[PDB]
Design an enzyme around this catalytic site. Structure first.
Site, PDB file in Angstrom:
ATOM      1  N   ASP A   7       0.882  -1.158   0.000  1.00 24.29           N
ATOM      2  CA  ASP A   7       0.000   0.000   0.000  1.00 24.29           C
ATOM      3  C   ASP A   7       0.929   1.219   0.000  1.00 24.29           C
ATOM      4  O   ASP A   7       1.552   1.524   1.015  1.00 24.29           O
ATOM      5  CB  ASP A   7      -0.873  -0.019   1.280  1.00 24.29           C
ATOM      6  CG  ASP A   7      -1.845   1.168   1.388  1.00 24.29           C
ATOM      7  OD1 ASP A   7      -1.881   2.065   0.525  1.00 24.29           O
ATOM      8  OD2 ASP A   7      -2.620   1.201   2.358  1.00 24.29           O
ATOM      9  N   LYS A  68       2.229  11.219  -4.092  1.00 23.16           N
ATOM     10  CA  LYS A  68       1.071  10.490  -4.659  1.00 23.16           C
ATOM     11  C   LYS A  68       0.056  11.407  -5.337  1.00 23.16           C
ATOM     12  O   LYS A  68      -0.638  10.979  -6.251  1.00 23.16           O
ATOM     13  CB  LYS A  68       0.355   9.654  -3.597  1.00 23.16           C
ATOM     14  CG  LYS A  68      -0.554   8.563  -4.180  1.00 23.16           C
ATOM     15  CD  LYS A  68      -1.580   8.083  -3.166  1.00 23.16           C
ATOM     16  CE  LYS A  68      -2.207   6.789  -3.591  1.00 23.16           C
ATOM     17  NZ  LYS A  68      -2.585   6.010  -2.374  1.00 23.16           N
ATOM     18  N   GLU A 172      -6.931  -0.027  -4.636  1.00 24.54           N
ATOM     19  CA  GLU A 172      -6.956  -0.124  -3.189  1.00 24.54           C
ATOM     20  C   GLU A 172      -8.221  -0.826  -2.626  1.00 24.54           C
ATOM     21  O   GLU A 172      -8.088  -1.697  -1.799  1.00 24.54           O
ATOM     22  CB  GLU A 172      -6.718   1.265  -2.559  1.00 24.54           C
ATOM     23  CG  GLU A 172      -5.260   1.761  -2.707  1.00 24.54           C
ATOM     24  CD  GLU A 172      -5.084   3.238  -2.427  1.00 24.54           C
ATOM     25  OE1 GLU A 172      -5.982   3.848  -1.818  1.00 24.54           O
ATOM     26  OE2 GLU A 172      -4.032   3.810  -2.805  1.00 24.54           O
ATOM     27  N   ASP A 196     -13.687   4.217   2.890  1.00 20.89           N
ATOM     28  CA  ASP A 196     -12.293   4.483   3.228  1.00 20.89           C
ATOM     29  C   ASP A 196     -12.147   5.896   3.766  1.00 20.89           C
ATOM     30  O   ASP A 196     -12.064   6.863   2.998  1.00 20.89           O
ATOM     31  CB  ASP A 196     -11.387   4.283   1.992  1.00 20.89           C
ATOM     32  CG  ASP A 196      -9.891   4.442   2.300  1.00 20.89           C
ATOM     33  OD1 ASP A 196      -9.485   4.862   3.418  1.00 20.89           O
ATOM     34  OD2 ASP A 196      -9.090   4.124   1.399  1.00 20.89           O
TER      35      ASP A 196
END
Ligand SMILES: Nc1ncnc2c1ncn2[C@@H]1O[C@H](COP(=O)(O)OP(=O)(O)OP(=O)(O)O)[C@@H](O)[C@H]1O
Ligand SMILES: [Mg+2]
Lengths: 379, 629
Positions: A7, A68, A172, A196
């Site tokens: 991850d 990211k 994810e 999430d």
């Protein structure tokens, strides 16, 4: 040799490996089961992970995080332009590719986002290698569902730079679903919603699963929630208390607020596992002791609008998916804020008592599923 | 029933269970993979584990940590002060000359023994496990430091009994880590092949242990073990706090040594700074309002820290050199060095351990989980419902142990039974000629081989029911002398022989006098624990019924305003709002601190009316679904 699951988180990363029929989440050399996606440049060295995060405030122009957000994106991306206003580091234009610009060993250096992420991936690789005792060369890496080809490819490039053989780039929420075994139900269409929420980012994904095959049906990001707003409600509530009991206002006292705030952050955290929390600040204001408490129910009430608002992306995602809430088969919780009982309650009361997949540490469930999927791709 | 292993650490405890085909780490109510080894006390209830830790800084005088370290501690022990300096609570001498904690609890002054206190924590941690597993848990294997005394092992086993558990084995902790190493590695030497020599170094909050083991597939033997019980993370935290105590007198003209609360703030912050210094080479030290109005802002480098602990680091190679001399080997004969415990993350320690072995360090175990996992595997070994893959292990028996007996007609009245540097468990068979009932005892053959002030006598036994045959001279008594799997010295069988043939005649009754508690005393302590458990539970349930009431008030009020609005008459809505409003005000008055029944009653008044409206809301929901399908 075993393959690993990574991850690559926007703020933290996590690595697992499937060994002896189970996923082992690997602790770094400081003992932490997640590693900050931070890379610091200094007058003498390069620091990655915890070392990088530990010195951010003393070296903010040269400590890179959030790569990211830049990875696989054009410099003129409205998202890149928007985001730049929030970072204390410089981002330059180089051929319409963003690069983070930095002082490194007394020199000015620019880095591609995938170069910063590769260094984080080298770190997770080293963590995995120290635990297994042999060279690790194969990895499944995860990306968000909304990532485009370029964002996906740029992440794979970061893998390749780190020395990894990227077996697959997976979503994810797909990883989280594989963690809970939701791909094992055979033929027939199942609707899974992954909720999430944590670290100030919020992603709702609806996937369809059929014969182990995943399809992304909807993504919905209410982008910013889970932080200082709850802290403020608690601060304001207690500022009022003090104003009431002692007939004095502490609002315009810079240090006292930060102190009462620190107390409220602590208290907030306690209320995820206890139904009440004490606050006790010695001589808070002008020599006056503030010993009080708050119940979980009171905390939830102060923040009831801030909590209810988590169902907006749920309701949005459902619309894009063109599904009724009654049509969701499985719920998966990921991200730290899903530990908050009210988050779990709201979701469950919204989805009519449906059980939640929550038993795997919500910070680790994505690396978990990636590690499962990495072992499958080698068997 | 599910096997439960307990790594009972001075700072934190790890919980592991043997189920399915494996061994799992049990997570607590806060979702942590360890629980703080803290027993605290309040006006209403005890604060155990995580909650103990949460309350700790606000009630330091009534919070006991260091639980492990006061087990079996003589109050006037020459090294009491190295123990007591880490206590924040009042310690007192007990009637047996041991140490307890004095504590304000439920409005009174209470004295608890180290055994009682450790039992409270084991009981909380037992509850975590059965709430996680949904299963019955009756057995534990507890991992202790290898320096634990025979007494201390009995004490902690009794602590488990007070928490309603059968202490199936008390295991040396890095033996338990070595067992988890053994059961998990898949390439161990197999036949005539040389065993694999692995040294294990565990440095935690308080102890530094080196233990060297030989591995083949399905087996380990411990070759050498050395401990420093006064070498741990807590000694680093303390050196850092003392350094800043001096600095702040000159820098801020404040004396944190004169202010226990201030001192404790620095101590707590010092651990966090220490940990930063395992990753970074410099670190700022910033503590706001260490006293009234005083903010401190300083720093420390890794090299400054290393200097701070110089006196401690002078002993840094000793447990390695001592464990190798015991194992009768040189450092070059070790294949791998495995590192566990939190304090092994310190760079100076890592370099020193590496350099002392002449090898790189390995880290192929989860450092935090290894002991608890081995302890859970060992607990499984003991279950009658056997379904573990076998693993054999022997541990080292450092001291020579003799047994003595009423001389009578024997030329000798004692012998060496369990030699120095043998293994346990071990059973020795002796036969003795006897004239009647007799006493026995076990003792250390050479007391100079033991820690200062170690009593020589370990245990004694009264053996009775001896009957002489017709030729009334003597009679042979066959004895079974056992160093059990916990390393405890026992007698487990005695019988008269000689009823053309040898034969058992009379099974003799053995009365044992050990460091273990009487059944009378055990039951009294089990009772006290049951009372405190009931009290804790009453308080936890009443706090819950009251938070459930407050939540329902807010929830049902909002629903009447929203999705329930079409489903209530004006008279129904205003009636319910009135009682909602009145129930909320009650929570500030008489309901601020009421009893369980009244929180339930108040909720039932509300819900009884609220459910009627909900049941109309739900009916039209289902109706719309028939207009769907
Ligand atoms: N990254 C780190 N750097 C330095 N010290 C650390 C780090 N992580 C943890 N520690 C220290 O390790 C200690 C906790 O380790 P551990 O869990 O091995 O102890 P324990 O089992 O409770 O203690 P003991 O075995 O002595 O009873 C604490 O003092 C903690 O500060
Ligand atoms: Mg330990």
């Amino acid at each position: 040799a075993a393959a690993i699951g990574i991850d690559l988180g926007t703020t933290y990363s996590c690595v697992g490996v499937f060994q002896h029929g189970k996923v082992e989440i690997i602790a770094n050399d400081q003992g932490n089961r997640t590693t900050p996606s931070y890379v610091a440049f200094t007058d003498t060295e390069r620091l990655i992970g915890d070392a990088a995060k530990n010195q951010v405030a003393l070296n903010p122009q040269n400590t890179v995080f959030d790569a990211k957000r830049l990875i696989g994106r054009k410099f003129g991306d409205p998202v890149v332009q928007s985001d730049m206003k929030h970072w204390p580091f410089q981002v330059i234009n180089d051929g319409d590719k963003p690069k983070v610009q930095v002082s490194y060993k007394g020199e000015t250096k620019a880095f591609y986002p995938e170069e910063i992420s590769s260094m984080v991936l080298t770190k997770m690789k080293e963590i995995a290698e120290a635990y297994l005792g042999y060279p690790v060369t194969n990895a499944v890496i995860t990306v968000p569902a909304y990532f485009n080809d370029s964002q996906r490819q740029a992440t794979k490039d970061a893998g390749v730079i780190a020395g990894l053989n990227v077996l697959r780039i997976i979503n994810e929420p797909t990883a989280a679903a594989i963690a809970y075994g939701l791909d094992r139900t055979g033929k027939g269409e199942r609707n899974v919603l992954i909720f999430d929420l944590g670290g100030g980012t919020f992603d709702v994904s609806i996937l369809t699963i059929d014969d182990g095959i995943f399809e992304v049906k909807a993504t919905a990001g209410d982008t910013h929630l889970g932080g200082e707003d709850f802290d403020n409600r608690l601060v304001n509530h207690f500022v009022e208390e003090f104003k009431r009991k002692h007939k004095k206002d502490i609002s315009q006292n810079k240090r006292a607020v930060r102190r009462l705030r620190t107390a409220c952050e602590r208290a907030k955290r306690t209320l995820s596992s206890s139904t009440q929390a004490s606050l006790e600040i010695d001589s808070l204001f002008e020599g006056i002791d503030f010993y009080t408490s708050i119940t979980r129910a009171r905390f939830e009430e102060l923040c009831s609008d801030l909590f209810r608002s988590t169902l907006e992306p749920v309701e949005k995602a459902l619309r894009d998916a063109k599904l009724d809430k009654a049509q969701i088969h499985d719920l998966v919780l990921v991200g730290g804020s899903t530990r908050i009982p009210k988050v779990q309650k709201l979701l469950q009361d919204f989805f009519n008592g449906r059980d939640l997949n929550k038993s795997i540490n919500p910070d680790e469930a994505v690396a978990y599923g990636a590690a499962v999927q990495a072992a499958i791709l080698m068997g | 029933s599910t096997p439960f292993g307990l790594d009972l650490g001075n700072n934190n405890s790890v919980l592991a269970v043997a189920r399915n085909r494996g061994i799992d780490i049990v997570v607590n109510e806060v979702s942590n993979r360890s629980t703080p080894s803290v027993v605290g006390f309040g006006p209403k209830n005890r604060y155990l584990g995580e909650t103990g830790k949460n309350k700790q800084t606000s009630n330091i005088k009534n919070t006991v940590a260091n639980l492990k370290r006061i087990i079996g501690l003589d109050y006037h022990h020459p090294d009491f002060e190295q123990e007591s300096k880490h206590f924040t609570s009042k310690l007192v001498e007990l009637d047996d000359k041991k140490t307890g904690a004095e504590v304000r609890f439920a409005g009174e002054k209470h004295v608890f023994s180290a055994t009682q206190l450790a039992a409270m924590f084991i009981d909380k941690v037992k509850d975590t496990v059965k709430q996680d597993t949904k299963a019955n848990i009756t057995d534990v294997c507890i991992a202790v430091p290898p320096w634990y005394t025979e007494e201390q092992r009995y004490n902690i086993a009794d602590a488990a009994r007070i928490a309603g558990l059968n202490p199936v084995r008390i295991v040396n902790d890095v033996t338990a880590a070595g067992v988890s190493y053994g059961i998990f590695k898949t390439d161990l030497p197999e036949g005539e092949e040389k065993p694999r020599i692995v040294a294990f170094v565990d440095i935690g909050h308080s102890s530094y242990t080196c233990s060297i083991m030989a591995f083949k597939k399905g087996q380990l033997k411990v070759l050498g073990t050395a401990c420093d019980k006064h070498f741990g993370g807590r000694d680093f935290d303390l050196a850092i706090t003392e350094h800043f105590a001096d600095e702040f007198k000159t820098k801020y003209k404040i004396d944190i040594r004169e202010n226990p609360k201030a001192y404790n703030r620095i101590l707590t912050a010092a651990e966090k700074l220490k940990k930063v210094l395992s990753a970074n080479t410099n670190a700022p030290f910033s503590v706001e309002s260490v006293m009234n109005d005083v903010d401190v802002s300083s720093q420390l480098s890794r090299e400054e820290l290393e200097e701070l602990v110089k006196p401690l680091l002078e002993r840094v190679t000793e447990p390695v050199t001592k464990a190798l001399a015991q194992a009768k080997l040189s450092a070059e004969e070790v294949d791998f060095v495995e590192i566990i415990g939190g304090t092994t993350r310190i760079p100076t320690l890592k370099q020193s351990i590496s350099e002392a072995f002449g090898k790189p360090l390995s880290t192929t175990l989860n450092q935090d989980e290894a002991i608890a996992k081995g302890a859970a595997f060992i607990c499984a070994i003991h279950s009658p419902t056997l379904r573990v893959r076998p693993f054999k292990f022997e541990d080292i028996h450092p001291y020579s142990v003799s047994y003595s007996w009423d001389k009578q007609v024997e030329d000798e009245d004692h012998m060496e039974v369990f030699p120095a540097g043998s293994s346990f468990p071990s059973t020795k068979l002796i036969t003795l000629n006897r004239t009647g009932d007799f006493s026995m005892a076990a003792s250390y053959t050479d007391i100079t081989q033991l820690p200062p002030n170690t009593p020589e006598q370990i245990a004694n036994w009264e053996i009775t029911g001896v009957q002489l045959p017709e030729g009334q001279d003597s009679v042979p008594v066959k004895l079974k002398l056992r160093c059990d799997p916990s390393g405890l010295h026992t007698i487990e069988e005695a019988y008269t022989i000689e009823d053309t043939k040898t034969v058992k005649k009379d099974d003799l009754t053995i009365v044992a006098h050990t460091f273990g508690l009487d059944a009378k005393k055990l039951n009294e302590l089990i009772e006290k624990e049951n009372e405190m458990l009931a009290q804790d539970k009453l308080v936890a349930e009443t706090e819950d019924r009251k938070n459930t009431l407050e939540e329902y008030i807010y929830t049902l009020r909002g629903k009447l305003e929203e999705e329930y609005a079409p489903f209530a008459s004006d008279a129904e809505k205003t009636k319910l709002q009135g009682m909602l409003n009145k129930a909320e005000e009650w929570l500030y008055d008489e309901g601020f601190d009421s009893i369980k029944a009244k929180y339930i009653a108040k909720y039932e008044e509300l819900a009884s009316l609220g459910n009627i409206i909900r049941g109309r809301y739900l009916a039209k929901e289902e109706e719309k679904k028939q207009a769907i399908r």
